[PDB]
Each structure stands twice: as C-alpha cells, then as structure tokens.
Short mmCIF file of C-alpha atoms and ligand atoms in Angstrom, two decimals:
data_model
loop_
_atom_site.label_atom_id
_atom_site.label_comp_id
_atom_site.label_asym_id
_atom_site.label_seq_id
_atom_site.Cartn_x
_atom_site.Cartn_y
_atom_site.Cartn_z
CA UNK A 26 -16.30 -4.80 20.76
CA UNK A 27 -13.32 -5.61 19.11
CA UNK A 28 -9.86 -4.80 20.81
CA UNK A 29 -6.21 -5.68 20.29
CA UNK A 30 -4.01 -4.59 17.03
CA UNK A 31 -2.25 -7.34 15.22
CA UNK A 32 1.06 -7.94 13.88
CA UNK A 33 2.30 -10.16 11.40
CA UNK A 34 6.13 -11.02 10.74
CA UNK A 35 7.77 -13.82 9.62
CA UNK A 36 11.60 -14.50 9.03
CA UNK A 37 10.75 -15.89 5.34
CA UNK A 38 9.95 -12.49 4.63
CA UNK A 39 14.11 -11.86 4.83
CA UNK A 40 14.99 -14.98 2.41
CA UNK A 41 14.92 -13.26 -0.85
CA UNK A 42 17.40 -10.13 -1.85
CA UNK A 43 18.80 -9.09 -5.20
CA UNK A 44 21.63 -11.46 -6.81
CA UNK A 45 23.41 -8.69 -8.65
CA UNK A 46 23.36 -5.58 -6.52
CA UNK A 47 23.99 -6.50 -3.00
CA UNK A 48 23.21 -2.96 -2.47
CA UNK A 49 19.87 -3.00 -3.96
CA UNK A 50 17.74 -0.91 -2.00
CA UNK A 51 14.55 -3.48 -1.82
CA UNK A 52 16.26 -5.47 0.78
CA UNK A 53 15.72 -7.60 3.93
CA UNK A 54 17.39 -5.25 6.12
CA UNK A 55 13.52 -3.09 5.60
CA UNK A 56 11.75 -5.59 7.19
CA UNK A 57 14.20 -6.29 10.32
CA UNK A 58 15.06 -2.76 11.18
CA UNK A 59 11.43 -2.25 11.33
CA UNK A 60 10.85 -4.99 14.10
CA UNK A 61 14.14 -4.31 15.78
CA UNK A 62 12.42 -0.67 15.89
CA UNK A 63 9.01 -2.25 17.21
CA UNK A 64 10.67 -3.64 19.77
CA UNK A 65 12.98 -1.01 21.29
CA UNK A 66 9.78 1.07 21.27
CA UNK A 67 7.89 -1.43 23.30
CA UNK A 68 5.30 -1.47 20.21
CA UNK A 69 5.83 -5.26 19.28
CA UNK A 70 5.50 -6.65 22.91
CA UNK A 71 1.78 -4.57 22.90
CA UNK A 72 1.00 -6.16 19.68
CA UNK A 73 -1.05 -9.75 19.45
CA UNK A 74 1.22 -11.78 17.52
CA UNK A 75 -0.80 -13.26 14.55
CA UNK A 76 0.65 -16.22 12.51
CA UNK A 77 1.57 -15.71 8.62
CA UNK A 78 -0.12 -18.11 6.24
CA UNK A 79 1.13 -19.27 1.97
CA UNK A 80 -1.97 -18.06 -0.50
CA UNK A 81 -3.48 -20.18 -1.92
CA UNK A 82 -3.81 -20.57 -5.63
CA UNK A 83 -7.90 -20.03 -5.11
CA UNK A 84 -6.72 -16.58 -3.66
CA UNK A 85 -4.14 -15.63 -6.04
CA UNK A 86 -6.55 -16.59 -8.75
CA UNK A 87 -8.67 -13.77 -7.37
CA UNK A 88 -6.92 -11.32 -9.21
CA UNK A 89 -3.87 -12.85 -11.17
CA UNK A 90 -4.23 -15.46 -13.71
CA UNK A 91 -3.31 -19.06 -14.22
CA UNK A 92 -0.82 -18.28 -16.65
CA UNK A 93 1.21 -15.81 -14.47
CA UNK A 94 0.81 -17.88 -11.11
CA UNK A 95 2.50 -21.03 -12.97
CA UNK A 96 5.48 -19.04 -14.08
CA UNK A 97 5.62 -17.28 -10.95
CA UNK A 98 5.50 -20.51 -9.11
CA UNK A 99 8.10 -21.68 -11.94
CA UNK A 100 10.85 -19.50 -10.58
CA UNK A 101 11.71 -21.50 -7.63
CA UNK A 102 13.81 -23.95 -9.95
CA UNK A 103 15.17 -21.22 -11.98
CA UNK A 104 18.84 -20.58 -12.23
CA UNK A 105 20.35 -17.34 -11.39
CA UNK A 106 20.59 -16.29 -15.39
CA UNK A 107 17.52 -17.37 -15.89
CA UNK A 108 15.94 -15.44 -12.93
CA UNK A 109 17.60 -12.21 -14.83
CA UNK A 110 16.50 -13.17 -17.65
CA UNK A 111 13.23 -13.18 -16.80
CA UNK A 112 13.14 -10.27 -14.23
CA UNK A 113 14.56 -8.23 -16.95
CA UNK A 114 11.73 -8.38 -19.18
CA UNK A 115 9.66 -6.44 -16.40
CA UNK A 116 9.89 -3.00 -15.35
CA UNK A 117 12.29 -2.37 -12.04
CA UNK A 118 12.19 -5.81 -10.91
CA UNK A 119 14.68 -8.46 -9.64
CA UNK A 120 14.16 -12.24 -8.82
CA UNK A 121 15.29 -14.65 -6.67
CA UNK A 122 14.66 -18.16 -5.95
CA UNK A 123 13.22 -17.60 -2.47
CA UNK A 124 10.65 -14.33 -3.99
CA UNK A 125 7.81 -16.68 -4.61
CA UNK A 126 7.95 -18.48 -1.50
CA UNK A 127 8.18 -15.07 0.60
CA UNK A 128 5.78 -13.46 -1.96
CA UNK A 129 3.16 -16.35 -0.70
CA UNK A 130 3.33 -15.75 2.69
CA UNK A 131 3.23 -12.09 1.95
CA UNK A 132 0.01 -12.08 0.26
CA UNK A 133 -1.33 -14.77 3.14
CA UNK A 134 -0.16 -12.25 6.02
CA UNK A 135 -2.65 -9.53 5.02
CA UNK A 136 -5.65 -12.64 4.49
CA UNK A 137 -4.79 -13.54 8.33
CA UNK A 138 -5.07 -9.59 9.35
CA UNK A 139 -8.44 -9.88 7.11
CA UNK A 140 -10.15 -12.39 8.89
CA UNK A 141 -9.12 -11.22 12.32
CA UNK A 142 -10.34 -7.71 11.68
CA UNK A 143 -13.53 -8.80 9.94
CA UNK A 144 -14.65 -11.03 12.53
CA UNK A 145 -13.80 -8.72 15.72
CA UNK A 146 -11.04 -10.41 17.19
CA UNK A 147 -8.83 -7.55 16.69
CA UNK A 148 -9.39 -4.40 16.13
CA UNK A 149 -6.69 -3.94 13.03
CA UNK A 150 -3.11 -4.78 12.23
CA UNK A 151 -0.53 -4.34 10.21
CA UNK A 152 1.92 -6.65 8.20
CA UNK A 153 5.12 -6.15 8.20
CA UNK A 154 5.49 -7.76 5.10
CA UNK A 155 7.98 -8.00 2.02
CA UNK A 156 7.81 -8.24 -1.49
CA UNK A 157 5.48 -5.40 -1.93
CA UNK A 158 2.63 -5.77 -3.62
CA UNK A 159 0.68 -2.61 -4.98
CA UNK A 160 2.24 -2.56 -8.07
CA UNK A 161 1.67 -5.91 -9.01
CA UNK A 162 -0.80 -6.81 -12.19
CA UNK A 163 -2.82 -9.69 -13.01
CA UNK A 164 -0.26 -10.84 -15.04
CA UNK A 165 2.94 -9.03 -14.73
CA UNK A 166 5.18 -8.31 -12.17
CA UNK A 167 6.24 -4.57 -11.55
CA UNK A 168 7.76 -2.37 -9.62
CA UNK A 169 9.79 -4.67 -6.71
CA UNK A 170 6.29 -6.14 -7.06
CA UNK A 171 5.20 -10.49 -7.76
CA UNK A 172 1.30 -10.48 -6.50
CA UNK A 173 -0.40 -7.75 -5.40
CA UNK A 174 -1.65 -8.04 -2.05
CA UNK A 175 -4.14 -5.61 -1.05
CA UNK A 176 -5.80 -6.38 -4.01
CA UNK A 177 -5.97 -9.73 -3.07
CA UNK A 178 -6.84 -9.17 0.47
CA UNK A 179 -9.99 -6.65 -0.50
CA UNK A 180 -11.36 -9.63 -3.11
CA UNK A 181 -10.87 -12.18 -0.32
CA UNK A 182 -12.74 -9.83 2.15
CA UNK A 183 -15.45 -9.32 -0.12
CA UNK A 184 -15.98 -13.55 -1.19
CA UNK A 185 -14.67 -14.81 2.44
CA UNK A 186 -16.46 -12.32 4.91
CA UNK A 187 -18.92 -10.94 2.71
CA UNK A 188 -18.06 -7.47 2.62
CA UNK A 189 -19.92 -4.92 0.28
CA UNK A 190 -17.51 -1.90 0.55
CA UNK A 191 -13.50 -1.58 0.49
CA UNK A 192 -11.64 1.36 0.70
CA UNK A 193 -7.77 1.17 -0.19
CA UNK A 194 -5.45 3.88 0.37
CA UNK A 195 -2.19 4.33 -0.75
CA UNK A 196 0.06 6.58 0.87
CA UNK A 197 3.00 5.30 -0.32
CA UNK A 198 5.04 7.96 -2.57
CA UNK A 199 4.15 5.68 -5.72
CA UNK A 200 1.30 5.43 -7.65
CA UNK A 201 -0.19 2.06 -7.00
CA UNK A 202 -0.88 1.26 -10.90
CA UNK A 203 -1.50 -2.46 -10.66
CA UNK A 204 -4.68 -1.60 -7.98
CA UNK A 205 -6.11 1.02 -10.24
CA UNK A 206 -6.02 -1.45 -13.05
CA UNK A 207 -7.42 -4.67 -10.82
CA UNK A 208 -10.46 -2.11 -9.93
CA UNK A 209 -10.94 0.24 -12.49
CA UNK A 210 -14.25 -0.70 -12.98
CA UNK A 211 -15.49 -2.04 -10.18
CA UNK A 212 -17.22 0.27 -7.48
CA UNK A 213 -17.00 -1.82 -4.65
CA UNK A 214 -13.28 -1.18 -4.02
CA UNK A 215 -12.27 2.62 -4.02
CA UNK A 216 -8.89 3.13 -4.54
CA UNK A 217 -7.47 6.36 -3.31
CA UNK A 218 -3.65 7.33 -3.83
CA UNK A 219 -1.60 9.65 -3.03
CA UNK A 220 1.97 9.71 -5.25
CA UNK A 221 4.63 11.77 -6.55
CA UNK A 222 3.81 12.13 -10.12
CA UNK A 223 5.71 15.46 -11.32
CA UNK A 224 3.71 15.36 -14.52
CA UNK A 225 4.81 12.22 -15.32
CA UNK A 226 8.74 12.47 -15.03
CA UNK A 227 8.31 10.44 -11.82
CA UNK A 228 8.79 6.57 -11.75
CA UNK A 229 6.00 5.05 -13.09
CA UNK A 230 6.12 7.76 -15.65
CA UNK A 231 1.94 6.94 -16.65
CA UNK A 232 -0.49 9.21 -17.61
CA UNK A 233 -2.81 7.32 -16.22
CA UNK A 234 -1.33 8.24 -13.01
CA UNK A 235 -3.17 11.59 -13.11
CA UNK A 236 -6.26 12.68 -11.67
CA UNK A 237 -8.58 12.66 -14.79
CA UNK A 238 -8.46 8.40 -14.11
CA UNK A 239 -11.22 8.25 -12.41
CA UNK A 240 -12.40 4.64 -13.06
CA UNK A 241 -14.46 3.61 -15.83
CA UNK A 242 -17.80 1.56 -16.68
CA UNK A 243 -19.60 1.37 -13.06
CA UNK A 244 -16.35 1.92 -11.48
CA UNK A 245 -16.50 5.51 -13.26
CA UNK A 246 -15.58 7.68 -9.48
CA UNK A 247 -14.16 5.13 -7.55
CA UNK A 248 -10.51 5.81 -8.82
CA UNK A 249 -8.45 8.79 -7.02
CA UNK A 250 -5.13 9.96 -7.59
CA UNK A 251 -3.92 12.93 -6.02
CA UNK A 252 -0.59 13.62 -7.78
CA UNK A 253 1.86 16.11 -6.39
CA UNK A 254 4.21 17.70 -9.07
CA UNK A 255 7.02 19.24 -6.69
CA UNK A 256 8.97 17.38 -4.47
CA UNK A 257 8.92 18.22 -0.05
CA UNK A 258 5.59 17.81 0.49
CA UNK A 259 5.35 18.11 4.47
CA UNK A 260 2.43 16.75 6.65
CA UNK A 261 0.44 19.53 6.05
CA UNK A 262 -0.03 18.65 2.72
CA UNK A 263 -0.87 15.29 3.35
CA UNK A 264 -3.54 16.27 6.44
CA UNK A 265 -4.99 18.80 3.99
CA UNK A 266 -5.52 16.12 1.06
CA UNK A 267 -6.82 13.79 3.60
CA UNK A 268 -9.45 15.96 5.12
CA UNK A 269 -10.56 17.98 1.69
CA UNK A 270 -10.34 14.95 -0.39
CA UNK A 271 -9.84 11.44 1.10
CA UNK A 272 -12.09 11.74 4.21
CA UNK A 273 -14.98 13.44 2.43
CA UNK A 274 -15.57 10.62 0.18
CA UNK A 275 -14.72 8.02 2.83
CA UNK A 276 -17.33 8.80 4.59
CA UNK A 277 -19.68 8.94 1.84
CA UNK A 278 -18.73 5.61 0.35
CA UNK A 279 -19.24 4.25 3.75
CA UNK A 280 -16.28 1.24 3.70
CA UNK A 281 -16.63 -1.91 6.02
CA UNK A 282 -12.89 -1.96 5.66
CA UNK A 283 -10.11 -0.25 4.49
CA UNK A 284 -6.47 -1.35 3.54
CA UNK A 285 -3.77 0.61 3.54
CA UNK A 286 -0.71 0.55 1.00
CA UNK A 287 1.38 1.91 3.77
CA UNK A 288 4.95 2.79 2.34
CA UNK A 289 6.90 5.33 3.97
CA UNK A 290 8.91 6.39 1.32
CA UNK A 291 7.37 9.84 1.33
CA UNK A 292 9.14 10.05 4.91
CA UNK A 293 11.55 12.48 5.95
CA UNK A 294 15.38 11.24 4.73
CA UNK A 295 13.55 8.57 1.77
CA UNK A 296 16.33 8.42 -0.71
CA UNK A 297 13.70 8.34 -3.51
CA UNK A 298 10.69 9.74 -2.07
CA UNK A 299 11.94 13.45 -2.28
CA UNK A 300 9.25 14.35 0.22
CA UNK A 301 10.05 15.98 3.93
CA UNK A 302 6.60 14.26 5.51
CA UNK A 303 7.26 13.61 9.05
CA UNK A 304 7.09 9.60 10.54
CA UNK A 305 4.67 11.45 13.40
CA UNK A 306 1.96 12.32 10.28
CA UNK A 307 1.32 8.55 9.69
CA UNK A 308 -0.01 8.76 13.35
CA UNK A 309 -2.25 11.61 12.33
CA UNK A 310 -3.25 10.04 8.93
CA UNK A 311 -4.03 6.58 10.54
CA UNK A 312 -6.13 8.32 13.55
CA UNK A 313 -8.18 9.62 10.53
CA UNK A 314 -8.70 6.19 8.49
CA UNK A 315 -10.41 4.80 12.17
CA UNK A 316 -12.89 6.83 11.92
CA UNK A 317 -14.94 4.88 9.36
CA UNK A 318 -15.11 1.28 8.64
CA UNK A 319 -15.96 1.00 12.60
CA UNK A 320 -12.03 0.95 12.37
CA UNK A 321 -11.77 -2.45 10.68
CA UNK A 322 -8.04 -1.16 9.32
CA UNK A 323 -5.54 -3.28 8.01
CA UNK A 324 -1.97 -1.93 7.05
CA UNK A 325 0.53 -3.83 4.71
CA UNK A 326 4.19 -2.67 4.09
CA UNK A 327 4.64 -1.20 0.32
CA UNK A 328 7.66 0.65 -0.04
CA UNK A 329 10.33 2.92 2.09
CA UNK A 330 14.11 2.04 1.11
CA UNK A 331 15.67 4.78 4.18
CA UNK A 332 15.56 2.05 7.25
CA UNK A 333 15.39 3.87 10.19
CA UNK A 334 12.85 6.59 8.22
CA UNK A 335 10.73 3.92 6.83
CA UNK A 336 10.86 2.04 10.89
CA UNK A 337 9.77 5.18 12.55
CA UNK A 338 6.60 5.65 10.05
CA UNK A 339 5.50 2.27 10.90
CA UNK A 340 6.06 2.94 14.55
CA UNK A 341 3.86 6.08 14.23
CA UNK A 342 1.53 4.38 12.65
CA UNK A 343 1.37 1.29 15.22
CA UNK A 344 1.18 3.87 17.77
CA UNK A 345 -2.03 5.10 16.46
CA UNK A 346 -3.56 1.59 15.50
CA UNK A 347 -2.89 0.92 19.46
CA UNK A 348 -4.91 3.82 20.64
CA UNK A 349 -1.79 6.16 22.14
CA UNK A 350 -2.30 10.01 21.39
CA UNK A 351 -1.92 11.74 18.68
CA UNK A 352 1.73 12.92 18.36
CA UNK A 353 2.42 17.01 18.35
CA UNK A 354 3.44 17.76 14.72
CA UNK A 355 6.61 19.20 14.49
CA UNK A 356 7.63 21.20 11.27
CA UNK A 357 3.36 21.53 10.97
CA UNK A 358 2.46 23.84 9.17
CA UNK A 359 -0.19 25.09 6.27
CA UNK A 360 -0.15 22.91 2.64
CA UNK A 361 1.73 24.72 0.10
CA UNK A 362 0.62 26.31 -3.15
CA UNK A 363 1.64 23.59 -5.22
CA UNK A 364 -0.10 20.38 -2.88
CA UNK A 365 -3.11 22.70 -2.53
CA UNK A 366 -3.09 23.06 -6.86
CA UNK A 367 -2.90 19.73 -6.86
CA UNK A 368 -5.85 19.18 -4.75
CA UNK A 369 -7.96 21.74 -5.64
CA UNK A 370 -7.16 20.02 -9.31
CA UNK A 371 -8.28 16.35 -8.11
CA UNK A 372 -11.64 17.60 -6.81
CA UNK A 373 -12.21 18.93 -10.07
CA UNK A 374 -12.42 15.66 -11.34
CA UNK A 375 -14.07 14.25 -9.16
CA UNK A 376 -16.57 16.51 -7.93
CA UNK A 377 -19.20 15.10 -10.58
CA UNK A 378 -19.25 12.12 -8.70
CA UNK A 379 -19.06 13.10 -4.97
CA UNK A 380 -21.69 15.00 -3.45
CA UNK A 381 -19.40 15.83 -0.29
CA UNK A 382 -16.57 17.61 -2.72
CA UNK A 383 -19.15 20.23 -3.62
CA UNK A 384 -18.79 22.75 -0.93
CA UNK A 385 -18.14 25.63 -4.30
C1 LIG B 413 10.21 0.59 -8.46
C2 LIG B 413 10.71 1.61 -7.48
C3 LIG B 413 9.98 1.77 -6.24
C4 LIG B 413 8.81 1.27 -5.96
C5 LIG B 413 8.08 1.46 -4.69
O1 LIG B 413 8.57 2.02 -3.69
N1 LIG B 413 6.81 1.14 -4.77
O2 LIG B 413 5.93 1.74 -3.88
C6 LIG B 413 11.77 2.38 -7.68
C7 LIG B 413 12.64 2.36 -8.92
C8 LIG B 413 12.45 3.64 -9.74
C9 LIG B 413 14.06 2.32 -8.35
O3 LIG B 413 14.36 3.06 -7.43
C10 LIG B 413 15.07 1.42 -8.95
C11 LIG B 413 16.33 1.32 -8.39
C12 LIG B 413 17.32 0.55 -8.97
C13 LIG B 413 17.07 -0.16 -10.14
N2 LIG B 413 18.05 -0.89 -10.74
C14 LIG B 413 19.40 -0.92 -10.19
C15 LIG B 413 17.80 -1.62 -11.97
C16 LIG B 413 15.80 -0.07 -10.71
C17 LIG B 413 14.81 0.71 -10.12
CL1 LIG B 414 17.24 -10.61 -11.22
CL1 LIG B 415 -9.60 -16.71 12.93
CL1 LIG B 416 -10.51 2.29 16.62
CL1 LIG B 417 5.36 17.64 10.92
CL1 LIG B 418 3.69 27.70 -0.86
NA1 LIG B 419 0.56 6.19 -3.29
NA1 LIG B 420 -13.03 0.78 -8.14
ZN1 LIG B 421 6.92 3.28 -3.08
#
C-alpha cells in the first residue's frame, strides 16, 4: 500500500509580487506564512519532501494554446509598463517578470504530486504553490491566475498514468470558471465547486456560475456548482453540501483521483471570503475526499489572502492527509436556511443525471 503525504515548496514560488500595490493581497508572504506554520506545527518535518519541477510546453499545451504560452513565456523580457499594459487587459490580474517562471514550476509541482500519488509512492500531497491556477483559461489569464494547474495536472494524469476518472473539487470561495470551461464537455473530469456567488454580485459576477451549468455535449452532468447567496457560511454548511451533494456523486462517478482547488479564503477572518468556515472543517472535508479514489488526493493552493487564516486551513488539511484525527468542530452546528436553499436548489439540477441525488 501506499503511505507517506507529500509536500511541495519551492522559494521561486516567492519571486513574483505586484509592482504597483506593494500591498496587493496576492503576495509571497501566503506562501511563507504557510510553511513557517507547517513547521511550528511539526506538519512539514512529517511530510516527504518532494522536488518541484518547470512544465513543459507538451503539458501546458494540454489545455492552453500555442498562442497564449508564447506571450506568456514573452513576459519575462517585458518592461514594467509593458507588464501593466498587458495585465490590464485581463480581469483582476497583475504581472511581473518573475510570474512565468514561478507560474512553471507551479503547474510542475502538482505533475510531481501526480505521479507520486498515481504510482503508490505516496499516499497524497499537497502543493504549496503560487500563482493560482483555477481561474486560468486556455488562452487568457484571470483572476491572479497565468495557467491553470489542476486542469493541467488531471489531463496529465489521464495521458501520463492512464487514468479514466478525475474528480476536481473546488472549495475555494471562488468559482473556478477557467476549469468549468477546460471540461465542460468532457465526462471524464467532474468538476465540483463550491463558491460565493450571491446571484451574481460576487467576483466573477457569471451566470454561468450558477447551478443550471451543468456541462454540455457528453459532459452534460459532470459540471457542479453549488453557489451560496449570503455570506457566513459555517462548516455545517459545507459538511452538509459535501455529504448531500459532493459525496453522493463521488462515489457514483467512482474517481481514480481527485484534485483539490484548495483555497481557504472561505476561512474564518478571509478579508474577501465573507464566510465564518472554521480552518478545523478542511480536516473534516479532506477526511471525506479519502474515502474514494483509494485516497489518491492531491491538494494545490488556490486562493486565501488572511495569512495566518489561510496557514491554519492548510494545516488542517495536512493534518488529515497525514492520518491524525478528526478535529472536534467548534462553532458546529446545523446548515442554515439559505446554504440548505442553495443545496436543495443544486440537486435540482442535477438530479436528472445522478441516480444517488434521488432519495425524493
Ligand atoms: C480575483 C480575486 C480573487 C481570486 C481568488 O481568490 N481566486 O480563488 C479577487 C478580486 C475580486 C480582488 O480581490 C482584487 C483586489 C484588488 C484589485 N486591484 C487593486 C486591481 C483587483 C482585484
Ligand atoms: Cl501589472
Ligand atoms: Cl517518480
Ligand atoms: Cl487514506
Ligand atoms: Cl466549526
Ligand atoms: Cl438559518
Ligand atoms: Na470554489
Ligand atoms: Na466534465
Ligand atoms: Zn479564491
């Protein structure tokens, strides 16, 4: 059997910040509070260390095209006006003549956790990883976002290691757009996410954020987004979408491995996230992605801007990848109204497709 969890981290991952808001909240301070965390913890030291690697163009190519790789790869030499110049014709994004560099070895971290995982010589991992990548598009960046890598990663699972089946969920507090799009219509990747959406007046502001995208063409099902449309959402919530909605289908799709777009800006004190969820639920919630796949599980920093919030979901969620109990929950407590409206609304649209969401 497979054993050990591993952990990728790499200082290249801190050589890129934003040249006109040294405040900016995507910063490298995320990534190094988070280890600095690991390590006062005792988490890193239990860890197997596992070495970053650059993409490959082959691998980008797997979702982005030639066009956008090139002028990604083209902002290296750019100056600092031209970097805003270009940045600035995307939605929330800044540049930087280190991003493509650190966005290689971003996308390459989650490959290494891939083939580790896939051929049992660990049992999962996580990256610790920056630029984000889940809002990435094939060619476009978005969203703090230059390549996206779990997109990457599950197309690289399924041509390097032959796997049939990915799940991806996405727990971070934004809708993961640029994974919906990369596998809207393809049903060997289901994408689940969970996201503040508040009918749209929440940052990505699409309607195809909702629940009625389902996927389309044989990917029609394999789309879910569970949007929540109030703000402090508390673990509850998220332990009752995971085991009315998320869990059901897992199970039925059967995954041989899942990724996880694990922000933590839905965490308790996330300055954008609005939401009151606990770091000790993202032991809970990553307890419940082991149980299928065999627990081939691979985690992958998205977002979380409040740094000692966003350290203590990852520690939570280490904890769990290493096999320590499951925390006590501490404001625990039933879902709410609105997250169980929302739910009960997702089903709907999915229950078609689903034979496990059919217990009505
Ligand atoms: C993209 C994003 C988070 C993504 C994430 O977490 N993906 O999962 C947040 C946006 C709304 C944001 O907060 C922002 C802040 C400052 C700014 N400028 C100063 C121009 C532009 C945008
Ligand atoms: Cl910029
Ligand atoms: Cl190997
Ligand atoms: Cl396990
Ligand atoms: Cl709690
Ligand atoms: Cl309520
Ligand atoms: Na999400
Ligand atoms: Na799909
Ligand atoms: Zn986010």
């Amino acid at each position: 059997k497979a054993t050990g969890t591993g952990l990728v981290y790499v200082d290249a991952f801190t050589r890129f910040h934003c040249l006109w808001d040294a405040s900016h909240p995507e910063c490298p301070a995320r990534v190094s509070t988070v280890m600095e965390m690991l390590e006062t913890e005792g988490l890193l030291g239990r860890c197997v260390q596992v070495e970053a690697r650059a993409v490959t163009e082959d691998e980008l190519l797997l979702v982005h095209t030639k066009e956008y790789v090139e002028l990604m790869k083209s902002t290296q030499n750019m100056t600092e006006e031209e970097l805003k110049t270009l940045a600035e014709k995307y939605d929330s994004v800044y540049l930087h003549p280190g991003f493509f560099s650190s966005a290689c070895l971003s996308v390459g971290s989650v490959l290494q956790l891939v083939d580790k995982v896939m051929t049992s010589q660990l049992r999962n991992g996580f990256s610790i990883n920056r630029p984000p990548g889940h809002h990435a598009q094939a060619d476009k960046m978005n969203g703090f976002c230059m390549f996206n890598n779990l997109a990457i990663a599950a197309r690289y699972a399924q041509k390097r290691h032959r796997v049939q089946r990915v799940l991806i969920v996405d727990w971070d507090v934004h809708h993961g757009q640029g994974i919906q799009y990369i596998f809207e219509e393809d049903p060997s990747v289901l994408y689940f996410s969970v996201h503040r959406y508040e009918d749209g007046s929440f940052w990505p502001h699409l309607k195809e954020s909702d629940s009625s995208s389902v996927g389309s063409g044989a990917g029609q099902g394999y789309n879910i987004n569970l949007p929540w449309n109030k703000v402090g959402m508390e673990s509850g919530d998220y332990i009752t979408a995971f085991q009315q909605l998320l869990l059901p289908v897992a199970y039925e799709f059967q995954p041989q491995l899942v990724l996880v777009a694990a922000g933590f800006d839905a965490v308790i004190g996330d300055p954008k996230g609005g939401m009151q969820v606990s770091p000790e639920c993202f032991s809970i919630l990553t307890h419940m992605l082991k149980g299928v796949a065999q627990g081939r599980l691979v985690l992958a920093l998205e977002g979380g801007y409040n740094l000692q919030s966003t350290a203590e979901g990852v520690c939570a969620s280490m904890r769990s990848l290493l096999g320590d109990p499951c925390p006590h929950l501490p404001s625990s407590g039933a879902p709410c109204e609105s997250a169980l409206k929302s739910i009960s609304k997702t089903i709907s649209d999915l229950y078609p497709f689903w034979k496990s969401l059919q217990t009505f």
